[PDB]
Design a protein around this nucleic acid. Structure first.
Lengths: 61, 135, 196, 50, 87, 105, 75, 131
RNA sequence: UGCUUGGACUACAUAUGGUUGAGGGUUGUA
RNA sequence: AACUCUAAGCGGUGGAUCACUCGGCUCAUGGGUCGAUGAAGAACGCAGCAAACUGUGCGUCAUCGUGUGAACUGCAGGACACAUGAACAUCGACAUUUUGAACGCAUAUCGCAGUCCAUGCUG
RNA sequence: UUAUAUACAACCUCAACUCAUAUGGGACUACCCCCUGAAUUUAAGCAUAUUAAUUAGGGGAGGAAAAGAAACUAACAAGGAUUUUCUUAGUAGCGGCGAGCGAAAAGAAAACAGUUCAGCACUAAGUCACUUUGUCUAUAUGGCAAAUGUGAGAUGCAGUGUA
RNA sequence: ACUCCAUCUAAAACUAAAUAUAACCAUGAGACCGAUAGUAAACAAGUACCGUGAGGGAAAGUUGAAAAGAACUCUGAAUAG
RNA sequence: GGUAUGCGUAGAAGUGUUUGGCGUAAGCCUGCAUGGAGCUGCCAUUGGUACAGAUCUUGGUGGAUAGUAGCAAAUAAUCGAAUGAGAGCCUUGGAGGACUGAAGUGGAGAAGGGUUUCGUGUGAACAGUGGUUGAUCACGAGUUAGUCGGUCCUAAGUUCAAGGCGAAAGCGAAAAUUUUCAAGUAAAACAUAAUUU
């Protein structure tokens, strides 16, 4: 453990950590679109969002 | 057209099945093009293709692929949708443009059988025995 | 209230037995193929055979449920309500009712506010109907099935049925008394008002 | 024999130690219905083939 | 002479132990395994063999991974976090 | 065989037994679907619980001249003819669906 | 779900041939499966009891729609 | 009853008893404290250590006794108590085991952790009376 | 260099980039 | 008395019956969990006394953390260092042999190497 | 600068690399997508038909998939993505018009959500990917800048916009 | 064929919900079966065994509340009486 | 599903039975015997609802015959001793008469086997007689390589860079085309040189 924790801080602020320091989770969620990258927004999508906010009404008689 | 690959020796059984040399595939030749690409380049997703030229023993095409792990395509919110997993091998499941041709999907009347979603899921649901609880 | 029993539709048929067929001095059922496992030849596939599939195996699409006509439910609830008075027909369900002071017995609305079960057997004492739910204590027994393996290890008989109108605390107050059960006037289940 | 592989002497090593009686003590464990060793092969009676 | 006479001349194995099955099934001369196909990169199961499919399927072995993986999910695929004493 | 009975046409020649649907979870899809409406009506707002507005009358054919196809549209002239706010109507919940080519005054 | 004592099998059990005959046993399908053959060995059964089977009277309306004849009635 | 995640099955409640592991077999082996102890601690019942003095009350022995326990044989759901014996044919006295539902704890072996059980178990007998 | 024992690497297909290149392919300046 | 036939008693053979049941069959509900970072599967090893089953990888019937708070139990030994923790659960730290997905080349060859670093003897 | 007499610089086409970084090949099987496709049977024979556009299939995915925002219905006082259930309906139609098969529009309900390109005009590449130097924090297949460091990119990337 | 009318915009791309579910995780049930039944398998069951192979494939539950599982004596060469 | 304020360790189910009756019958009640924990009458509604047969299924058992057919090829043993509870064996050792008869009933290896090997013990089982013996059972042991083999070479053949083909999986592939599709060399410049398909 002392060898493995000591290898992690020598590998901080470096891109390309070694494979066995790279957060195993699955293979299926490892290949798929890092949660920033799913939420990239085309300028059509971040212009039609900011114009018309969804309002909070009550159509009640 | 596709010659049924029967062993020289018959398609046995009834004469209805006895046909060897006028059979035609239910798939295209364009769809058969994209397959033999996308089979072979297992780590690149297919987008479409187009005819480019032909001569008389070889119709031949031009397939568009997309690596889905290059960052310039992962960053790209206009092309990003093919990076999802639900598009793995998206034409071995029939789903390009030139794959959806041979299924038969459309609307309405003329494409009625088959309207269950695809084409096989219609005969599942046409033939479905509903054994209701309160007969 | 009745869910499906049905045997496994692969029970019977995952042997691979072909009728080792005449003339081998032994009869003609499908016999098991192997040799060496002593399940050979030994009789497969038929209901006469050990291991073989039952005569018609029980499926899930047997009609378990039903639709009664809904006037016939109301003209079955009506006859049950009308016979919950008339103490000749309460007393012929057992039902010790010879202490009660009225039929059909009506208590005030204040009893819906009762909240602890001690103050319910105080209440069912005073209206002389405790002797019925003391009879439900007498016939707590064990079933004589197959219930006793299959999670019905008994009932007792039934007791009264407090038809309230608004549960102020009443339904929680009458839970743990054995035999009694309460109901609300809008619902009025028949299977309560004529058990059996 | 006399001319066997390494893989075949290793598998015939293992099938020589699985060929044992039950230890005399595990007959006495609480709820131990191990009567005999059940899968004791025997050189001329059952071969191996497997 | 089709009988006990001929059955004595049988002393050369048609099949050896496989690598991904470890079973006397590797036909040497085909260089193929009758039960899994050693040089096939794919497992050799069929749908008309329902019994044989479940004699060598997921779960019959030790699933060194598809057992702990099943547990990591109940805890939400956490990792790198270690516990602390209860307070 | 025998008798005066009604020529049969039961369509049971096609290995039908593998097409059978149970319906034993009729009740806990009614319970599923209801607990979702409760879930969704609370996860909106004071906003209406159904709730779009759903226009029409005049279901098509000669049988139903009157009993509605259930109104998808509100067909932008009816928005423009009514003080809104065609893009805006969608943000309230008026259900603006721009495929109907309103054929009557 | 059907009261079986009134079913015959509670009663025919067990006399031997279960109501179906010693001579002319209950065999599998001794006449044809289904409407075979209402034009040879069932023809008498098919005319009487259904005169009008086996032909074509005619005017084909490919895709009848049941609104062009709706017209409910009242006297 | 009323909880939906709570089984009422005899097929289930005996498997999830007779295969309960060796640290939940602690809970299932609980013994009633004597009526003096409910004054001294206000806890109804407590699981047993190896060395809590105990008094059999139900059984052929049935007790009026300073019995210490020698072992709580958890795989037999039983306890052996330090007089409660029986002769073999040789005459070597062996233990007769008693299920700790039918024993009675007289003096608990107080250490630091068992005491904080009686702090855990002695507030909740109060706060179930303030409802 | 001679041997021993340890480690690390070396499969194919591919995408972008890097690096050396190839061509009576196509031009350009000498 | 032989022997035979008939019955009950008694004794044997035999395992029906009944009574049980940590197992099945069916129905329903909450879920989404996935391998080139080597999966699924296979082989072989591992305990003081173990064959299998279960568990597991030279750290090998385990396992850091953490919860719980005196055991395991067929015997033996240790432990009881509970106050700085038994055994069990849990599991996020580490680890995970030969294989298959050997990723150098390959076989009914424990076969044969190429380059690189290090340890040792060369020297 | 091209008799194949040398070199330079481009570009195109194409190589090689134990180059730096990445993907790819699971195996499961109930559901799902695309293929490919019998015969037993039934017709009281049998050959089209029937089984069945189905067993065997057999390549490819997900927690659902496929579908899906009209080259649709309809003929009305008009409807309006897809999917699912009820009904239409065992109906129109198909069929040695034999055995047999066999849908949809409308209605009712569940749930409801819309949209993006390419392409004239949009009139300063306004564009992306790494690359090293800081900064921002984190196990960020990051952000802010910087050199405008390569490279991509007019054989066109971006903004605006869509039947 | 000929005159109009009605209706949509092919040959490019996404998209939740309702829906499906003999597999996988984790649960609750039942007019089910009760050891020749129910899974083949209630147990060291895909085990033992058989086949070159593909493949095939069993039998097998119950001492008592507690082992208190019969010390000791005699006879025997002895398990045993 | 209701009911009998049913029955039950003061003995339930089941089982036996020259207990005693009831019924026209199917059946049923009851005593005693054994047994040791559950069970019934009635009103509904139901079912995997009644067996003598099916060369029925699965387990058990009879006659034959419980001791009958039979344990007869490969010439053959006999003495005395030691064992031992018991010896025709093989148990052994001494005499011994014989057989195989060098193309052996001899001594070793291949394939196959998989510990049978070899010591010390030994009861049942097995050794179609016995058994003190055993290829059995129990427990301890045992296979040593630079030189003997593999390993190294290539044969028939597997055919195996996809140039190709096929919807795929995959391929009755002496490929015959796949830029260098080469195996290559301490070799000079301005892709090391005649070269290897």
């Amino acid at each position: 453990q002392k060898q493995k924790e000591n290898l992690r801080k020598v590998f901080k602020n470096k891109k390309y950590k070694p494979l066995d320091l790279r957060k195993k989770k699955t293979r299926a969620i490892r290949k798929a679109l890092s949660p920033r990258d799913a939420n990239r927004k085309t300028l059509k999508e971040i212009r039609k969002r900011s114009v018309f906010p969804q309002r909070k009404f009550a159509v009640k008689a | 057209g596709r010659k049924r690959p029967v062993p020289k020796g018959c398609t046995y059984g009834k004469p209805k099945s006895h046909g060897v040399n006028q059979l035609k595939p239910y798939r295209g030749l364009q769809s058969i093009a994209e397959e033999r690409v996308g089979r072979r380049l297992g780590g690149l997703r297919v987008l479409n293709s187009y005819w480019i030229a032909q001569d008389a023993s070889y119709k031949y095409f031009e397939v568009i692929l997309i690596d889905t792990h290059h960052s310039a395509i992962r960053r790209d919110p206009k092309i990003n949708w093919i990076c999802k997993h639900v598009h793995k091998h998206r034409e071995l499941r029939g789903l390009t443009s030139a794959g959806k041709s041979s299924r038969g999907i459309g609307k309405g009347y003329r494409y009625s059988q088959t309207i269950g979603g695809s084409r096989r899921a219609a005969w599942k649901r046409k033939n479905r025995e509903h054994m209701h609880r309160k007969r | 209230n009745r869910q499906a029993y049905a045997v496994s539709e692969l029970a019977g048929h995952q042997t691979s037995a072909e009728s080792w067929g005449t003339g081998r001095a032994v009869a003609r059922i499908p016999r098991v193929r192997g040799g060496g496992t002593h399940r050979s030849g030994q009789g497969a596939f038929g209901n006469m055979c050990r291991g073989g599939r039952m005569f018609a195996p029980t499926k899930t699409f047997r009609r378990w449920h039903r639709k009664v006509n809904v006037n016939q439910r109301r003209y079955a609830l009506v006859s049950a309500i009308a016979a919950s008075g008339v103490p000749a027909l309460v007393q012929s369900k057992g039902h010790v009712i010879d202490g009660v002071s009225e039929f059909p017995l009506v208590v005030s609305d204040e009893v819906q506010k009762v909240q602890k079960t001690k103050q319910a057997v105080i209440f069912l004492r005073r209206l002389k109907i405790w002797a019925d739910i003391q009879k439900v204590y007498k016939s707590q027994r064990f079933r004589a099935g197959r219930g006793t393996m299959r999670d019905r290890r008994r009932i007792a008989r039934r007791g009264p049925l407090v038809v309230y109108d608004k549960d102020e605390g009443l339904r929680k107050a009458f839970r743990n008394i054995p035999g009694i059960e309460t109901i609300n006037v809008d619902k009025l289940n028949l299977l309560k008002l004529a058990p059996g | 024999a006399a001319h066997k592989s390494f893989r075949i002497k290793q598998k015939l090593a293992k099938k020589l130690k699985q060929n044992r009686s039950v230890p005399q003590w595990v007959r006495l464990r609480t709820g131990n219905t191990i009567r005999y060793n059940a899968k004791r092969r025997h050189w001329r009676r059952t071969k191996l083939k497997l | 002479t089709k009988g006990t006479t001929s059955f004595g001349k049988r002393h050369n194995k048609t099949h050896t132990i496989c690598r991904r099955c470890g079973n006397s099934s590797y036909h040497l001369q085909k260089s193929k395994c009758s039960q899994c196909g050693y040089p096939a990169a794919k497992t050799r199961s069929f749908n008309w063999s329902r019994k044989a499919k479940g004699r060598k399927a997921q779960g019959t072995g030790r699933m060194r991974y598809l057992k702990n993986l099943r547990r990591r999910f109940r805890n939400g695929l956490r990792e790198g976090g270690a516990a602390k004493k209860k307070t | 065989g025998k008798g005066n009975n009604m020529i049969p046409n039961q369509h049971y020649h096609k290995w039908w037994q593998r097409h059978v649907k149970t319906w034993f979870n009729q009740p806990a899809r009614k319970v599923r679907r209801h607990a979702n409406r409760v879930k969704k009506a609370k996860a909106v707002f004071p906003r209406p619980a159904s709730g779009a507005l759903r226009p029409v009358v005049r279901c098509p054919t000669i049988r139903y001249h009157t009993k509605l196809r259930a109104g998808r549209g509100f067909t932008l002239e009816e928005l423009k003819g009514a003080g809104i706010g065609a893009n805006f109507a969608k943000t309230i919940g008026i259900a603006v669906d721009r495929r109907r080519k309103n054929k009557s005054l | 779900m059907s009261n079986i004592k009134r079913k015959k099998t509670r009663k025919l059990r067990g006399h031997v041939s279960h109501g179906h005959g010693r001579i002319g046993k209950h065999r599998k399908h001794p006449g044809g499966r289904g409407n075979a053959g209402g034009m040879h060995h069932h023809r008498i059964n098919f005319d009487k009891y259904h005169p009008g089977y086996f032909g074509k009277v005619g005017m084909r309306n490919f895709h009848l729609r049941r609104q062009h004849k709706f017209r409910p009635e009242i006297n | 009853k009323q909880n939906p995640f709570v089984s009422s099955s005899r097929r289930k409640n005996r498997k999830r008893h007779f295969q309960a592991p060796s640290h939940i077999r602690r809970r299932l082996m609980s013994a009633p404290l004597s009526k003096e102890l409910r004054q001294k601690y206000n806890v109804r019942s407590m699981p047993i250590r190896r060395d809590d003095e105990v008094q059999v009350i139900r059984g052929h022995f049935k007790g009026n006794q300073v019995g210490k326990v020698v072992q709580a044989y958890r795989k037999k759901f039983v306890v052996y108590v330090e007089k409660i014996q029986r002769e073999n044919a040789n005459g070597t006295n062996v233990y007769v085991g008693i299920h700790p539902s039918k024993v009675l704890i007289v003096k608990l072996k107080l250490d630091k952790d068992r005491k904080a059980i009686l702090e855990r178990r002695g507030k909740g007998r109060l706060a179930a009376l303030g409802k």
